[PDB]
Amino acid sequence: ISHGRVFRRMGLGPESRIHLLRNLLTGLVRHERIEAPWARVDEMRGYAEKLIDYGKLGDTNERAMRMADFWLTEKDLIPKLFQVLAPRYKDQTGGYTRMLQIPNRSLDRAKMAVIEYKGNCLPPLPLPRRDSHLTLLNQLLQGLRQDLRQSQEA
Amino acid sequence: AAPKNRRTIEVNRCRRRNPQKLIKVKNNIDVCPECGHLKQKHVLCAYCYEKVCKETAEIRRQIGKQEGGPFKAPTIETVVLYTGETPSEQDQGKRIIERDRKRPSWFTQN
Amino acid sequence: TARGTPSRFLASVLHNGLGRYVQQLQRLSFSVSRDGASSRGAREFVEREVIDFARRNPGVVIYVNSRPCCVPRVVAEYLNGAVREESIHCKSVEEISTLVQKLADQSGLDVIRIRKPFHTDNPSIQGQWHPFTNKPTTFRGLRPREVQDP
Amino acid sequence: KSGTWWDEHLSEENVPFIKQLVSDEDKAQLASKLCPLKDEPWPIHPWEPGSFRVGLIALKLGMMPLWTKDGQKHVVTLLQVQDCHVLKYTSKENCNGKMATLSVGGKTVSRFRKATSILEFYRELGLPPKQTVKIFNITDNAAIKPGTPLYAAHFRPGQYVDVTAKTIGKGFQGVMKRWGFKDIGRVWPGTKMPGKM
Amino acid sequence: VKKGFRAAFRFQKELERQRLLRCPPPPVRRSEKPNWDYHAEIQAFGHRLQENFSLDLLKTAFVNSCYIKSEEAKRQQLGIVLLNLKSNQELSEQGTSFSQTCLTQFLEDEYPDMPTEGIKNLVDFLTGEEVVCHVARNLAVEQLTLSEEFPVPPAVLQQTFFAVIGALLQSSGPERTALFIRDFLITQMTGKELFEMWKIINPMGLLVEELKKRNVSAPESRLTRQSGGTTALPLYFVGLYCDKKLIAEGPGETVLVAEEEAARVALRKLYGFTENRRPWNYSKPK
Amino acid sequence: FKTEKEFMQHARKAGLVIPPEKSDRSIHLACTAGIFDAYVPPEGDARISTERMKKTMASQVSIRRIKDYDANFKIKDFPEKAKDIFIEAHLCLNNSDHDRLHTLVTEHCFPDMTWDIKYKTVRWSFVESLEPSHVVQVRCSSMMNQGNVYGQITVRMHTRQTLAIYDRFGRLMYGQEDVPKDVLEYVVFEKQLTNPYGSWRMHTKIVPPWAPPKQPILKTVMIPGPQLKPEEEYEE
Amino acid sequence: ISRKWEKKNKIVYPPQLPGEPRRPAEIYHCRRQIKYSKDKMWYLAKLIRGMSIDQALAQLEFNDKKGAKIIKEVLLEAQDMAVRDHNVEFRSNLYIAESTSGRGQCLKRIRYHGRGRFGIMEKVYCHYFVKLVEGPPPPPEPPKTAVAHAKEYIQQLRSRTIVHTL
Amino acid sequence: QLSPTELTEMRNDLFNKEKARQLSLTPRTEKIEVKHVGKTDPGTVFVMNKNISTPYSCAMHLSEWYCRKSILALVDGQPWDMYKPLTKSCEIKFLTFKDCDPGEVNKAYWRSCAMMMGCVIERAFKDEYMVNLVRAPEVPVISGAFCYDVVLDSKLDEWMPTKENLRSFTKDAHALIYKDLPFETLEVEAKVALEIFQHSKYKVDFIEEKASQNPERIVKLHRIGDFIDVSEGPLIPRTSICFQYEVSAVHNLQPTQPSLIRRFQGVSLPVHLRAHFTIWDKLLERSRKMVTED
Numbered sequence A: 001i002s003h004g005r006v007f008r009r010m011g012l013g014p015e016s017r018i019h020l021l022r023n024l025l026t027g028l029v030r031h032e033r034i035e036a037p038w039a040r041v042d043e044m045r046g047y048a049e050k051l052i053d054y055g056k057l058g059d060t061n062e063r064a065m066r067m068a069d070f071w072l073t074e075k076d077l078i079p080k081l082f083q084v085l086a087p088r089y090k091d092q093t094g095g096y097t098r099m100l101q102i103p104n105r106s107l108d109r110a111k112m113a114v115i116e117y118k119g120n121c122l123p124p125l126p127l128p129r130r131d132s133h134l135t136l137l138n139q140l141l142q143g144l145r146q147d148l149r150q151s152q153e154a
Numbered sequence B: 001a002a003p004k005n006r007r008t009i010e011v012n013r014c015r016r017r018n019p020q021k022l023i024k025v026k027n028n029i030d031v032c033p034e035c036g037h038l039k040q041k042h043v044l045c046a047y048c049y050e051k052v053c054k055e056t057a058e059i060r061r062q063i064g065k066q067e068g069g070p071f072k073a074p075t076i077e078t079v080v081l082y083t084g085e086t087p088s089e090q091d092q093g094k095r096i097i098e099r100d101r102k103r104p105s106w107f108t109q110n
Numbered sequence C: 001t002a003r004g005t006p007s008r009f010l011a012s013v014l015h016n017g018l019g020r021y022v023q024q025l026q027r028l029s030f031s032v033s034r035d036g037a038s039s040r041g042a043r044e045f046v047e048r049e050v051i052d053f054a055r056r057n058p059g060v061v062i063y064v065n066s067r068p069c070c071v072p073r074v075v076a077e078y079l080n081g082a083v084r085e086e087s088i089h090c091k092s093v094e095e096i097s098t099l100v101q102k103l104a105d106q107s108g109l110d111v112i113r114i115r116k117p118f119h120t121d122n123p124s125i126q127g128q129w130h131p132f133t134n135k136p137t138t139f140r141g142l143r144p145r146e147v148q149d150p
Numbered sequence D: 001k002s003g004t005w006w007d008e009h010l011s012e013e014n015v016p017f018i019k020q021l022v023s024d025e026d027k028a029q030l031a032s033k034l035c036p037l038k039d040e041p042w043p044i045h046p047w048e049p050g051s052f053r054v055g056l057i058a059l060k061l062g063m064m065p066l067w068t069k070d071g072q073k074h075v076v077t078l079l080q081v082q083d084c085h086v087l088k089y090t091s092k093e094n095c096n097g098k099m100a101t102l103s104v105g106g107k108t109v110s111r112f113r114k115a116t117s118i119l120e121f122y123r124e125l126g127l128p129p130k131q132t133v134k135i136f137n138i139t140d141n142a143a144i145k146p147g148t149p150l151y152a153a154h155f156r157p158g159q160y161v162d163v164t165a166k167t168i169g170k171g172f173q174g175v176m177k178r179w180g181f182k183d184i185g186r187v188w189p190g191t192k193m194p195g196k197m
Numbered sequence E: 001v002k003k004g005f006r007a008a009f010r011f012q013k014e015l016e017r018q019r020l021l022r023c024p025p026p027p028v029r030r031s032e033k034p035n036w037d038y039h040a041e042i043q044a045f046g047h048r049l050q051e052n053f054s055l056d057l058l059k060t061a062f063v064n065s066c067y068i069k070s071e072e073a074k075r076q077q078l079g080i081v082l083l084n085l086k087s088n089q090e091l092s093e094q095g096t097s098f099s100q101t102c103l104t105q106f107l108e109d110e111y112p113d114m115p116t117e118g119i120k121n122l123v124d125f126l127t128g129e130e131v132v133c134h135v136a137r138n139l140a141v142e143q144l145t146l147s148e149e150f151p152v153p154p155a156v157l158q159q160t161f162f163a164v165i166g167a168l169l170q171s172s173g174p175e176r177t178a179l180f181i182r183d184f185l186i187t188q189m190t191g192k193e194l195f196e197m198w199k200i201i202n203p204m205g206l207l208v209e210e211l212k213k214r215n216v217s218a219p220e221s222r223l224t225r226q227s228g229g230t231t232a233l234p235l236y237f238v239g240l241y242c243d244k245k246l247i248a249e250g251p252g253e254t255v256l257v258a259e260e261e262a263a264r265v266a267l268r269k270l271y272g273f274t275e276n277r278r279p280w281n282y283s284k285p286k
Numbered sequence F: 001f002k003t004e005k006e007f008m009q010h011a012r013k014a015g016l017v018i019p020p021e022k023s024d025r026s027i028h029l030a031c032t033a034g035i036f037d038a039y040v041p042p043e044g045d046a047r048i049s050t051e052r053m054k055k056t057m058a059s060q061v062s063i064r065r066i067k068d069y070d071a072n073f074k075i076k077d078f079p080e081k082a083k084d085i086f087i088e089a090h091l092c093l094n095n096s097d098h099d100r101l102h103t104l105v106t107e108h109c110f111p112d113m114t115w116d117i118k119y120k121t122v123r124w125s126f127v128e129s130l131e132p133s134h135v136v137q138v139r140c141s142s143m144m145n146q147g148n149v150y151g152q153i154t155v156r157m158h159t160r161q162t163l164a165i166y167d168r169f170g171r172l173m174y175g176q177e178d179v180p181k182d183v184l185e186y187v188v189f190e191k192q193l194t195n196p197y198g199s200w201r202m203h204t205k206i207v208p209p210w211a212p213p214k215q216p217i218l219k220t221v222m223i224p225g226p227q228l229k230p231e232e233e234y235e236e
Numbered sequence G: 001i002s003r004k005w006e007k008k009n010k011i012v013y014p015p016q017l018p019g020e021p022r023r024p025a026e027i028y029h030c031r032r033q034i035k036y037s038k039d040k041m042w043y044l045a046k047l048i049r050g051m052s053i054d055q056a057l058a059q060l061e062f063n064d065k066k067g068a069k070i071i072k073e074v075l076l077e078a079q080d081m082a083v084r085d086h087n088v089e090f091r092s093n094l095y096i097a098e099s100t101s102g103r104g105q106c107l108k109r110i111r112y113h114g115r116g117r118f119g120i121m122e123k124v125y126c127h128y129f130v131k132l133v134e135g136p137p138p139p140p141e142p143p144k145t146a147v148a149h150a151k152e153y154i155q156q157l158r159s160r161t162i163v164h165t166l
Numbered sequence H: 001q002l003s004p005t006e007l008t009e010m011r012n013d014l015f016n017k018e019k020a021r022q023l024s025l026t027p028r029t030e031k032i033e034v035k036h037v038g039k040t041d042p043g044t045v046f047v048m049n050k051n052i053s054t055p056y057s058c059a060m061h062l063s064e065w066y067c068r069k070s071i072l073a074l075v076d077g078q079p080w081d082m083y084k085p086l087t088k089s090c091e092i093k094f095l096t097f098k099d100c101d102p103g104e105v106n107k108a109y110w111r112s113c114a115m116m117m118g119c120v121i122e123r124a125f126k127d128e129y130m131v132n133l134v135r136a137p138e139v140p141v142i143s144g145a146f147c148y149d150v151v152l153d154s155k156l157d158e159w160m161p162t163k164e165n166l167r168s169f170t171k172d173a174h175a176l177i178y179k180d181l182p183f184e185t186l187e188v189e190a191k192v193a194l195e196i197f198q199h200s201k202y203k204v205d206f207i208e209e210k211a212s213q214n215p216e217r218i219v220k221l222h223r224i225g226d227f228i229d230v231s232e233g234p235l236i237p238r239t240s241i242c243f244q245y246e247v248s249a250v251h252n253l254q255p256t257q258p259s260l261i262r263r264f265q266g267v268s269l270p271v272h273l274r275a276h277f278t279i280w281d282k283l284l285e286r287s288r289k290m291v292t293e294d
Ligand SMILES: [Mg+2]
Pocket: A010, A011
């Protein structure tokens, strides 16, 4: 029974799980786009979002610096977090990362995901795009919406 | 426990060929609009994704040369500039990565 | 097996015997060795028995081919297209005479299990039984527990 | 030939519009059933010994302590009635039962995830689809017109009620947790073994 | 490798049988196969039938026009004596004419109450391509037939069969040929129900016309028997009554089918072609 | 790798030192790779139906060499002989008579004639000859290895032929079975003058650029565009 | 060993007469000695039976099994061969007529057990066979209807004879 | 005078004859170089047959995914039917419902759906009554429905289609969809087209109108099965492309006095753009509302 068990069991145990996520998070901050097994990227995505929130507290904040020190193994990333990533998202209240499933990797056919920090310099990922408004179904719904405006106005 | 008797081919076919054992037909396959290759609806196109990764790898190799060592992550934003392009006013005060290539059509300067 | 073999119903060729009797055997082909111990009986049959048989059965055409062979054979062909090959290897003249006459009297139909020892195209003279054959009729064809003048 | 879901082919502009449109109709469909006694209600009969009125579908909010004037504590479960309406009435003859049946519906749910046949049933009734539908055995004098809303004040304090629901699923469990356990040549039907609990 | 020859030879014959079954060779004419002598086969054909055929006439019966044309083309291309072969066209006309009139006289005598349309349809069935080709094949006619194409086309085989009947007519005269028609063509309706040979539509219409000619009242249909009427497998017996007198009764899964069968039963009785009628007499005239 | 250089480059990278082989025996060739002196068919030749002297003189020099090996040779008879060889060779295609075809055509011609039609059915017929064939050119090679001297004669043939090629399944893929069509062909014939058993055999055909395009094929064809890797971008 | 499958493409048919309907082209192709078990390969071969060439390629492309890539290459080779060498017009106008796996020539290796017993492990190989036919995929036989069932049952009743009598 | 069944036979025979006549114009096989200029498979060249091969045949060369999704073709930049023979060498592009700008594809679907309604209504009424097909109005797809202008018999002036009658029309239309009939197209001179529609005065007027617009006096004809109609633009390849099809309502257009023109209206969605049952109902309502051509 695993009712309400939010966290996955990974690696060699609890401590190993955090270190596995920390290594993935450290790679994401440096590269801004990494690809790994889907479950691990999904497990790490929450920490990636929360790390940006600590970066918004500022480097002067002692608790935030302690968080960045632990979660960022490579210390040169800590300045990047507070001075690059955090200011980038100053306006946004969330949704810092986007996660997309990519084809299963050849060796073990593991389900794979790509996760990136929105706004990176890297070439854009081929995001899924909703159908054009000009399509037949959308045009029929656009006409319906316009009529409901006239009826509402009356 | 050892088997009491040899299982006949008749019995084994019923087991091996049961619908539960057969590969299910997939209905979520589609054609990628950009490249025309096949993809699943919920998965990124393999052909298009590899195209992005190839260019991303070249840019990362260029970033490595500029940094020229480990633990040298910059404290400013990065901008990729292709041949025939000049730094924008918005893209000023940022690390500039120069690619000896024409900007890909899918990669749009912002 | 009966289950492991085919079967058929008792039959005749072209209703043979209804208007006239026609001998179904039409051709006998013998292969006999000039030299060969196994053909001794066949050679003797050709010398003293084939000619008398040929006259008795003018409807049958008999081909005797003398050639080197280890197993002398007689091929019997019938009007219905049946072909029946038999071996006369090392058979005496009497045994060959018996086999040849047996072929002459056969119809050419497959010698397989015959389901019934009788065949008729008119099994009934008075009408085949049906469930109403021995049931009396009722006034106005009323059914059990049916009410007239509904 | 391929599968589709409601917003598969909708554009960015039409996803918010359609979500509003189907939500406004639902709110207006539930507000049109708020006056059943002026919408040609079925005959309202007095209660008679041996009568069986309908029940309702409620959502289990949780539990709370309750104290009585004698100083005893009682834990109670809060059951909230959400969008409960009568859906169908079946007479004794057609129901294949001694008592007539009243079908009642529970929580409102999305129309985009319901079968076409179910969607057609609710379209005639004029109500948003429900999550659960239960059958109550009633007498002929307790029949309520389909579409009538049922409220929590259908029950009164001091009354007793049977409550039926699906139990928390524990999955495949062993004899110890399932049954509390730590020779005719065969196992009897009904023997307590490991299985879905 | 085991020393020996008999087993290997026997297995070779075994493999040849499979090689035949796997690829069954294309059927060929009997005349091409071994142990064939045309003149002897022609003589046995007559004696087998107990007929004194004229060999010159009988040989001409098997010569088809198509064969003569094909032979000429072969001779011309392979340039090599005038051929005077007479086709069986003349003989087949005489045989076809005699067979049609001979069968008509036979049927009219047996079934005086049969209408001319019924008699014609029976004569067409007895002389039909189906019946005649079946009889000809089982009498060795196809083996002696000279044709360009094998297996002999149904039309060519039927023409040759009547040509043989024409040769018999000239050889032994009309009386002898009639017994040949009786023994091989009249027998072909053994076991067959009238309407299996003579195909009719709307029997009830034909019955009403025949009753009118006899001045009988129009038949009335009534339900003599009924069972399981409201089931997928019902049974109905329908009786036809003239002046409230039963003339026929027929079963059917539906009332309409039973009524149509009753009409067929009535027609069989009227035409004297019932299932239990006196059988055909084959006793030698005496 | 198919090329020999790549094979020997792979062999040196594998340490597989293959020693060469010297033997008294050598491959014995009965024909040559190509035309000794290509005969450019004058443009407009089909339209009609000092340089000429110089070209004709070369044929007169060559015809003498052919006469030396075989004195009883007449260039006048060759056009009739060449026509017969041409017709017989093509007739062998109808019935896949390869052993007979080898006598009529050289080892250079044989692959071209029969390779493509290995699993096809060819129906070809020589309907008529519109104008008499004449020997346009006569050349002769210089002394080659093994003392082999070859003589090549080019014959211009304008004839009416019929060709219908069926595929492996009996379905018509080219031509018409009976419709006669007009064909102008320049056919080079070769003979090993040294070989005591050499005979005049069809060698090759000459296709001038002005030659009109051949009959269109029945089926439609798709010529695929560049198959590009993900990184590579298509360029018009 | 046996290599009949390769020879089937070499069959040459007589030219068809104009009346005859156009005979669909047939292409036979296979890959020998694949490093895979025929049992596992059978499911992949079964899956694409009766599919169009494009539908089969699509299903195999997104199949995780190792055999799927191998079969996909064989199918692409067969498609290219059909148009190029077998006079097939449209490459898409092909369907999987026959698709099966066969036991290859296997290698036996000395293997070990946890108690020191000596064992033979077989390194399994297999063959994949495919036959492509020109044309659209034959429509799947529809489900037997109630009307068809009733007709069959009534036919059985009507075929009943009086058993073991004159 | 020709009866309904007889009139169709005459139309088909004249349609078949002209179709054969156009094929005979090129007796021999002639090859055209069609170059694919689409986003995918760039640089592909099709050596198709002149006047026989169609865009669909080019799609068959590429893949089945092109055949299933190619609703329309852009031949030299002009909307082309999938089954319309390619006259000359040109550049070809394939259009789908989900293209960024499927305006041309949407018009072709609307025209083909309207034509499908003409066939249903023409054959739905009893023999005694006479149905005359005036035209198919060109209505933007954002209007909510497609329509066909039909002049019903005088005896039916009072009669108005009931809810049950409308359902009958849809069942006939769905029967047309189930038949999966190709949309055959013939571009004939005005003279030939006028002969086929001589019986109907409305068609003759329309034929002369369209013929005048073109300088070569060529009119586009389309046939569904045995039903021939005049169309202004290309049509979708097959009727099976439609999945949801309904005849929403029939509206009478003033002025009724000169003639009673009834606007039969319907709405439909293709298989590619299937809508949910709930969304389909919303589209159905607005289709019932009368559409005014502008
Ligand atoms: Mg683990």
